[PDB]
């Protein structure tokens, strides 16, 4: 996250870290056994780390659980990034309380101008690299689809939205992928891609979660 602030420990209780001997992507807990992330984050051997604040120190709210199932959307396209969503089933259920909790799925899509909270342990620089120990947050609005398409001609599908700023300085970045975009208490976006990070006229692009609620529910029910 570039241009954000320190969230505070366990203030974003649904945020998870995906680890393969190192943090590589984020995710969002949607029930005690299932996590939503981005399809471009798929790999074998994922360990999900719940209850984290400082990802480099064992502080006392961590639950480390191996993924038992890592399910990419069947129509994920790795060149256009369309349908960038993955569901991860935990090998055992997480224990839920105030510091580890699920986030609700949308009941309808969100609107342009609504403020959302984006979070993760990704790069905090728009030039160069610096990875944080503690979770970072950013408040950012949903942009109109016409602004998003003007920013990225020919690349915005109906399963994507832009959120953030056009003036530069505030955005998600490498290492934030898969993590949450929460608006009005609902998981509306998944951190997916962008041209660089926090660059003028190039806002972040996110997977539009409201289009996949029925697919999420069916995939969980059959697995």
């Amino acid at each position: 996250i570039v241009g954000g602030y320190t969230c505070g420990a366990n203030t974003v209780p649904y945020q998870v870290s995906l680890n393969s001997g190192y943090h590589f992507c984020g995710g969002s807990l949607i029930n005690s056994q299932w996590v939503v992330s981005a399809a471009h984050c798929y790999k074998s051997g994922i360990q999900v780390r719940l209850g984290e604040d400082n990802i480099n120190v064992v502080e006392g709210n961590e639950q480390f659980i191996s993924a038992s199932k890592s399910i990419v959307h069947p129509s994920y396209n790795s060149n256009t990034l369309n349908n960038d969503i993955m569901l991860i089933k935990l090998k055992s259920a997480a224990s839920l309380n105030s510091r580890v909790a699920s986030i609700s799925l949308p009941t309808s899509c969100a609107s342009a101008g609504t403020q959302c909270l984006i979070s993760g342990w990704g790069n905090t620089k728009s030039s160069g690299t610096s990875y944080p120990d503690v979770l970072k947050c950013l408040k950012a609005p949903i942009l109109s689809d016409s602004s998003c398409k003007s920013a990225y001609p020919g690349q915005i599908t109906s399963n994507m939205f832009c959120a953030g700023y056009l003036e530069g300085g505030k955005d998600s970045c490498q290492g934030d992928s898969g993590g949450p975009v929460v608006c009005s208490g609902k998981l509306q976006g998944i951190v997916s891609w962008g041209s660089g990070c926090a660059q003028k006229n190039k806002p972040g692009v996110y997977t539009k979660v409201c289009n996949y609620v029925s697919w999420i529910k069916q995939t969980i029910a059959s697995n």
Binding site: H40, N79, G122, Q155, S172, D176, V191, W193
Partner: peptide
């Protein structure tokens, strides 16, 4: 110049 935000990033010619 598009890149996904994973570590490491997946990036394209634009």
């Amino acid at each position: 110049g598009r890149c996904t935000k994973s570590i490491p990033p997946i990036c394209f010619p634009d």
